[PDB]
C-alpha cells in the first residue's frame, strides 16, 4: 500500500465512480467489508482479539 495511493481519502474525486474503498487499518483494497471498513485480513485479526464487539466465531 503506497502512502501516495491512499489519495482515496480525498473525498474530492472528479466523479463518484472513481471513489473506491481501502481498509481503515492496513490500507488494503482487495477485499474490504463495508460493515467494518476493514479488509478480510484485518477483520480476522481484530475479530480474534475480541476488539470487534458482538463479532465471534460462527459454528453450526
Amino acid at each position: 500500500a503506497r502512502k501516495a495511493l491512499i489519495e482515496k481519502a480525498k473525498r474530492t474525486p472528479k466523479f463518484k465512480v472513481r471513489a473506491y474503498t481501502r481498509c481503515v487499518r492496513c490500507g488494503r483494497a482487495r477485499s474490504v467489508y463495508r460493515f467494518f471498513g476493514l479488509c478480510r485480513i484485518c477483520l480476522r485479526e481484530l475479530a480474534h482479539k475480541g476488539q470487534l464487539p458482538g463479532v465471534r466465531k460462527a459454528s453450526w
Partner: protein, 98 residues
C-alpha cells in the same frame, strides 16, 4: 400504551435489561405484555484464513443481533418514573415508542 424494543449482541445482557424494564414497570402500572423474544438477525463473515492464496482456508465469523418486546400498556407517571431514572446495560440499545 408504550412499546419497548430492546436489542443487543449479548443475549444475557438483554435478558438482564429487559427483565428489569419489566419488574420495574410491573408495579407503577400494568404488568406489561411480557418480554417477547423475536427472531435474531445474523451476520456472516467468511474470510480466507491466511493472507495470499490458500482459497480453501476460510474460518467463519458472525455478528448476532438479538431482539425483545416487553410492551407496556397503561403508563402512569410513576410507570415512566421507574424508567427514565434507573438504567444500566451497556450492550443494550433501547427503543421506546407508543
Amino acid at each position: 400504551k408504550i412499546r419497548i424494543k430492546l436489542r443487543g449482541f449479548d443475549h444475557k445482557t438483554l435478558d438482564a435489561s429487559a427483565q428489569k424494564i419489566v419488574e420495574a414497570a410491573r408495579r407503577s402500572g400494568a404488568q406489561v405484555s411480557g418480554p417477547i423474544p423475536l427472531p435474531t438477525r445474523v451476520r456472516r463473515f467468511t474470510v480466507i484464513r491466511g493472507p495470499f492464496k490458500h482459497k480453501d482456508s476460510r474460518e467463519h465469523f458472525e455478528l448476532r443481533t438479538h431482539n425483545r418486546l416487553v410492551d407496556i400498556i397503561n403508563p402512569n407517571r410513576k410507570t415512566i418514573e421507574q424508567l427514565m431514572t434507573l438504567d444500566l446495560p451497556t450492550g443494550v440499545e433501547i427503543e421506546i415508542k407508543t
